[PDB]
Amino acid sequence: LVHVASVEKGRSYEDFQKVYNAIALKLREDDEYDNYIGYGPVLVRLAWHISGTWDKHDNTGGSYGGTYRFKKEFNDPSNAGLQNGFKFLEPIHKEFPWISSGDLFSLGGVTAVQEMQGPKIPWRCGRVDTPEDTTPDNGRLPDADKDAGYVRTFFQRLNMNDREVVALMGAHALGKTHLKNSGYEGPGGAANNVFTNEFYLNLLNEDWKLEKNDANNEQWDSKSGYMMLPTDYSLIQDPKYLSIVKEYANDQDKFFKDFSKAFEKLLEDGITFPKDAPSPFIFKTLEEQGL
Ligand code: HEM
Ligand SMILES: C[n+]1ccsc1
DSSP: OOOBOOOOTTOOHHHHHHHHHHHHHHHHHSTTHHHHTOSHHHHHHHHHHHHTTOBTTTTBSSSTTOGGGSHHHHTOGGGTTTHHHHHHHHHHHHHSTTSOHHHHHHHHHHHHHHHTTOOOOOBOOOOOOOOGGGOOOSOOSOOSSOOHHHHHHHHHTTTOOHHHHHHHHGGGGSSOBOHHHHSOOBOSSSOTTSOOSHHHHHHHHSOEEEEEOTTSOEEEEETTSOEEOHHHHHHHHSHHHHHHHHHHHSOHHHHHHHHHHHHHHHHHTTOBOOTTSOOOBOOOOHHHHTO
């Protein structure tokens, strides 16, 4: 399967910076969502789940085709709760009907991270919508109730290595688990709509307790009111993972730099970019624009 990036006709940096600003302006406006967390965390989760279907072996799945717009992927049990990120973006797609679905879902994730004061993420245009029959089947996204060997093995399919996996998981400092979506409940920290390295700090400094929640699932709970998933706590159980966790709890700039590279790579897996294709765009935030 080859998927070649095709820039939307005649579009350039300024067009996509207009779509960025539209998403970012609505993130500021619709602030009440999920008890004032706002839409940013569900939008970086949506960009991860449309990319996380990729399989390196046959180049199926991935962010290129925008296939989450089809019922099979929209109704995947693993995507429960992401309909709220879709409905947030649907106004903006009506306003810029020329951007492809893959591009709009991935730029929403980029915009949310930078607007929640994360690192800049280089983003590239050119994903092309593909037919309903290209939609990957349910079951390619990871279970939460498993251990470190499962996480390592699952992420080899998206060929991410240990460092990349640990840098990507730092995004679980954002938002929260919702019992009616996943059977898990609670936030992982106090700053859950500002991008920081707090996931790593909480993992190493809190007093975790294995408890059973109302959906009868086990999760790691702390006195402070935070929770960690079994696959999250996995990172301090494995010796290779645990020493990268310590590296990111001791250096927030290295965390930001490595997250930026692994999230771009995540979003680009499966796509062939021609050598005459434009460079990756670095978008300015509303704040850097005085907007
Ligand atoms: C083995 C890996 C992973 C598993 C099992 C997993 C699982 C989960 C689960 C069960 C939730 C709760 C969903 C809900 O109830 O609403 C969640 C939320 C979230 N995850 Fe993951 N995740 C994984 C990796 C990642 C990665 C790599 C990213 C992003 C780079 C990510 C970003 C998020 C975000 C931002 C949320 C919060 C959503 C919200 O607030 O609504 N996840 N994760
Ligand atoms: C620990 N955690 C927070 C959001 S998803 C998992």
